[PDB]
């Protein structure tokens, strides 16, 4: 039969309908008064967290991060620029807000490594994402068969190098075939045309 988890999942398929709508309108009021990065005891979306690798265990942390909505906050050119490069308003950044959120979180927790992250809504001027972080130094995780892979030296600062799922997604690596010519094995190796 259905898992209790499937109900949290189904509720989040429409964050603007039913009980969840009322809930969001209430929580966001408290979220707007909270900081940039807020550690939280439990994930707002259990199904999603667990689905992404989360575990109610020592060394597993979660934090809600809010980033501003919109395009790039760009400074206009202060020297000669051809009309193509004179833009300011319509320029958007190449990393998505979820990715910015992940990085701001990882910086708050220098010792932890980003496992994954998910959206928890947005108001008219900002978006919130909850990031799941992992303590690669706690033996509770160094012995966890499912998560000890993140303890490897090469997983250090995995978020800053785009090894996160949202990172890889944003790097245009989803497709294994057509369209991923300039993306795999890396954007930089492909001359930065991805």
């Amino acid at each position: 039969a259905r898992s209790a988890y499937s109900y949290i999942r189904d509720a989040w398929k429409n964050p603007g309908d039913g009980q969840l709508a009322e809930l969001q309108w209430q929580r966001q009021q408290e979220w707007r008064n909270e900081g940039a990065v807020e550690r939280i005891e439990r994930p707002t979306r259990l199904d999603k967290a667990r689905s992404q690798g989360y575990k109610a265990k020592q060394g597993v942390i979660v934090a809600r991060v809010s980033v501003r909505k919109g395009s790039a906050r760009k400074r206009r050119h202060k020297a000669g620029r051809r009309s193509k490069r004179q833009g300011v308003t319509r320029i958007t950044r190449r990393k998505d807000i979820q990715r910015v959120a992940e990085e701001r979180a990882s910086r708050t927790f220098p010792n932890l490594r980003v496992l994954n992250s998910y959206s928890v809504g947005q108001d008219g001027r900002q978006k919130w994402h909850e990031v799941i972080l992992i303590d690669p130094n706690h033996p509770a995780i160094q012995n966890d068969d499912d998560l000890s892979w993140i303890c490897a030296d090469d997983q250090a600062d995995r978020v800053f190098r785009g090894l996160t799922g949202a990172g890889r997604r944003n790097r245009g690596l989803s497709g294994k075939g057509k369209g991923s010519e300039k993306t795999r094995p890396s954007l930089r190796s492909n001359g930065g045309k991805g």
Partner: protein
């Protein structure tokens, strides 16, 4: 210059002379779905747009004749080389 609305002349379709009706070619309306329309949408962004930033030129002092010759029997039309004419009026 004056020009007969109808007259006998060669019909390239029937391969024999027939009474044709002369008509001034009315401009057909655009769909906005041709390749050039798509390229305009695609290639237009921040700053100058290259060719898509140009504005159509002027006019020649006199335009050439732009007519359609419609065959009276088979009902088909054919085009001809036009000639410079300030004004072209039809007779009947």
């Amino acid at each position: 210059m004056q020009m007969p609305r109808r007259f006998n002349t060669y019909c390239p379709h029937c391969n024999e002379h027939q009474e044709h009706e002369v008509e001034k070619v009315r401009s057909g309306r655009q769909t906005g779905m041709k390749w050039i329309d798509r390229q305009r949408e695609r290639n237009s962004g921040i700053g100058n747009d290259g060719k898509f930033s140009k504005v159509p030129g002027g006019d020649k002092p006199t335009k050439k004749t732009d007519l359609k010759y419609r065959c009276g029997e088979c009902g088909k039309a054919h085009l001809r080389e036009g000639w410079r004419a300030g004004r072209l009026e039809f007779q009947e």
